[PDB]
DNA sequence: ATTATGACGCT
């Protein structure tokens, strides 16, 4: 009873920016906006593969990963931006600027952790209370909350859903205790109400948004409404909530592990998981995933927000599939040298940017035929920005996978550069 | 012949 915590120390927020790389091709280009539209990378083959959908063009069916030729079956009026080309591939540096943009907005509200080129933790627990002594026992009006549901409400028009269900919430609140979770979850979706205008305001761009009391459910949160809305999850609302969420829609679990987890324990959803002690989860699952998992099912989370804005590790990658797989000397060096071009333009500008040098190099490769994504990953030494000399390295340190007897085997069907080990600079 | 990345765990 009174000695079981119940994880509602923290006020976590995730922010997502809808189909974000479609956005960026909105706000540059208006014939775009309020349309079916899609963001594709290449275009040659079955007109390009899909890496973003407007909800528009989703309401026909319209998906990521999908061809583009495809895509025009379901929707023949989807209007398609296309990925910059660089050096022969894909250049994704309007979106990492464009992200650039929102992640310094947030970061002047609380801490951020980047999750991705579109998504940031927020840890607003700060924020909250220095907000709360601010109001000094003013009551939360329905006006400061024009886009958040709260889940599990309205109980006992999507718009007059909303409203109901909010004004239920905000009749129930208890303002004069300054350390109820409730209280607390509900001044953090104030602020992020807040965070989200300027970020609309500033960028051009909306976002969705999840507040609950851990990442987890954070980030579950910021799905259940979208686009352009933020939601609630409160601790009280875990145990309905959780009782028909399928496993695999909690974060990492949504692969082999949620798989075995559903295999093993004969079950189908979340809530399902309060039902077997610590000790069991651990015996399945290994120590730390069941300590997590009996945590998790009932709602609480520790993993904390990180102060990290910037990007751990910089990456370039190119897939060569089926017949162009690199099959020559010539070709895996000249595309080690493409890579490697855009690697250092990239390098040089986080060094201007952000004051820190990356000091190692990781080299990946993938050979024709071969099960694994990585074939091959191999280090070595980043210690100068030059191109040249980073493709050199890296064809040193791949080289005796070559079996030929100026010819390559097996062909190459993806390279991949990494520059890590970042120290300040 | 979804592709381009990027975080993190295991050993
Ligand atoms: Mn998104
Ligand atoms: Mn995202």
């Given at each position: 009873?009174?000695?079981?915590?119940?994880?509602?120390?923290?006020?976590?927020?995730?922010?997502?920016?809808?189909?974000?790389?479609?956005?960026?091709?909105?706000?540059?280009?208006?014939?775009?906006?309020?349309?079916?539209?899609?963001?594709?990378?290449?275009?040659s083959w079955?007109?390009?593969?899909?890496?973003?959908?407007?909800?528009?063009?989703?309401?026909?069916?319209?998906?990521?990963?999908?061809?583009?030729?495809?895509?025009?079956?379901?929707?023949?009026?989807?209007?398609?931006?296309?990925?910059?080309?660089?050096?022969?591939?894909?250049?994704?540096?309007?979106?990492?600027?464009?992200?650039?943009?929102?992640?310094?907005?947030?970061?002047?509200?609380?801490?951020?952790?980047?999750?991705?080129?579109?998504?940031?933790?927020?840890?607003?627990?700060?924020?909250?209370?220095?907000?709360?002594?601010?109001?000094?026992?003013?009551?939360?009006?329905?006006?400061?909350?024009?886009?958040?549901?709260?889940?599990?409400?309205?109980?006992?028009?999507?718009?007059?859903?909303?409203?109901?269900?909010?004004?239920?919430?905000?009749?129930?609140?208890?303002?004069?205790?300054?350390?109820?979770?409730?209280?607390?979850?509900?001044?953090?979706?104030?602020?992020?109400?807040?965070?989200?205008?300027?970020?609309?305001?500033?960028?051009?761009?909306?976002?969705?948004?999840?507040?609950?009391?851990?990442?987890?459910?954070?980030?579950?949160?910021?799905?259940?409404?979208?686009?352009?809305?933020?939601?609630?999850?409160?601790?009280?609302?875990?145990?309905?909530?959780?009782?028909?969420?399928?496993?695999?829609?909690?974060?990492?679990?949504?692969?082999?592990?949620?798989?075995?987890?559903?295999?093993?324990?004969?079950?189908?959803?979340?809530?399902?998981?309060?039902?077997?002690?610590?000790?069991?989860?651990?015996?399945?699952?290994?120590?730390?995933?069941?300590?997590?998992?009996?945590?998790?099912?009932?709602?609480?989370?520790?993993?904390?927000?990180?102060?990290?804005?910037?990007?751990?590790?910089?990456?370039?990658?190119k897939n060569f599939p089926g017949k162009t797989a690199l099959a020559?000397?010539?070709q895996?060096?000249?595309?080690?040298?493409?890579?490697?071009?855009?690697?250092?333009?990239?390098?040089?500008?986080?060094?201007?940017?952000?004051?820190?040098?990356?000091?190692?190099?990781?080299?990946?490769?993938?050979?024709?035929?071969?099960?694994?994504?990585?074939?091959?990953?191999?280090?070595?030494?980043?210690?100068?920005?030059?191109?040249?000399?980073?493709?050199?390295?890296?064809?040193?340190?791949?080289?005796?996978?070559?079996?030929?007897?100026?010819?390559?085997?097996?062909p190459l069907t993806?390279?991949?550069?990494?520059?890590?080990?970042?120290?300040?600079?």
């Amino acid at each position: 009873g009174p000695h079981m915590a119940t994880g509602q120390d923290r006020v976590v927020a995730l922010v997502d920016m809808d189909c974000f790389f479609v956005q960026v091709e909105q706000r540059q280009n208006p014939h775009l906006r309020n349309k079916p539209c899609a963001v594709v990378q290449y275009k040659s083959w079955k007109g390009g593969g899909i890496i973003a959908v407007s909800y528009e063009a989703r309401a026909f069916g319209v998906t990521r990963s999908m061809w583009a030729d495809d895509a025009k079956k379901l929707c023949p009026d989807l209007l398609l931006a296309q990925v910059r080309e660089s050096r022969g591939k894909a250049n994704l540096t309007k979106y990492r600027e464009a992200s650039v943009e929102v992640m310094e907005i947030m970061s002047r509200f609380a801490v951020i952790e980047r999750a991705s080129i579109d998504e940031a933790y927020v840890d607003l627990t700060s924020a909250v209370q220095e907000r709360l002594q601010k109001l000094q026992g003013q009551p939360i009006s329905a006006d400061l909350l024009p886009s958040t549901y709260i889940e599990g409400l309205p109980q006992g028009q999507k718009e007059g859903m909303r409203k109901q269900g909010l004004f239920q919430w905000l009749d129930s609140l208890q303002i004069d205790n300054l350390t109820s979770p409730d209280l607390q979850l509900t001044v953090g979706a104030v602020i992020v109400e807040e965070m989200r205008a300027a970020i609309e305001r500033e960028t051009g761009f909306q976002c969705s948004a999840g507040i609950s009391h851990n990442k987890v459910l954070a980030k579950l949160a910021c799905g259940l409404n979208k686009p352009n809305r933020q939601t609630l999850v409160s601790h009280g609302s875990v145990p309905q909530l959780f009782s028909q969420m399928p496993i695999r829609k909690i974060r990492s679990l949504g692969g082999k592990l949620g798989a075995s987890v559903i295999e093993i324990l004969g079950i189908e959803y979340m809530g399902e998981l309060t039902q077997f002690t610590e000790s069991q989860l651990q015996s399945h699952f290994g120590e730390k995933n069941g300590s997590w998992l009996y945590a998790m099912c009932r709602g609480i989370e520790h993993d904390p927000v990180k102060p990290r804005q910037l990007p751990k590790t910089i990456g370039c990658s190119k897939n060569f599939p089926g017949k162009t797989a690199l099959a020559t000397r010539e070709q895996v060096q000249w595309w080690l040298l493409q890579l490697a071009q855009e690697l250092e333009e990239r390098l040089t500008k986080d060094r201007n940017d952000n004051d820190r040098v990356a000091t190692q190099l990781v080299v990946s490769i993938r050979v024709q035929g071969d099960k694994r994504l990585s074939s091959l990953r191999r280090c070595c030494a980043l210690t100068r920005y030059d191109a040249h000399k980073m493709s050199h390295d890296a064809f040193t340190v791949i080289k005796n996978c070559n079996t030929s007897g100026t010819e390559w085997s097996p062909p190459l069907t993806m390279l991949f550069l990494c520059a890590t080990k970042f120290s300040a600079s």
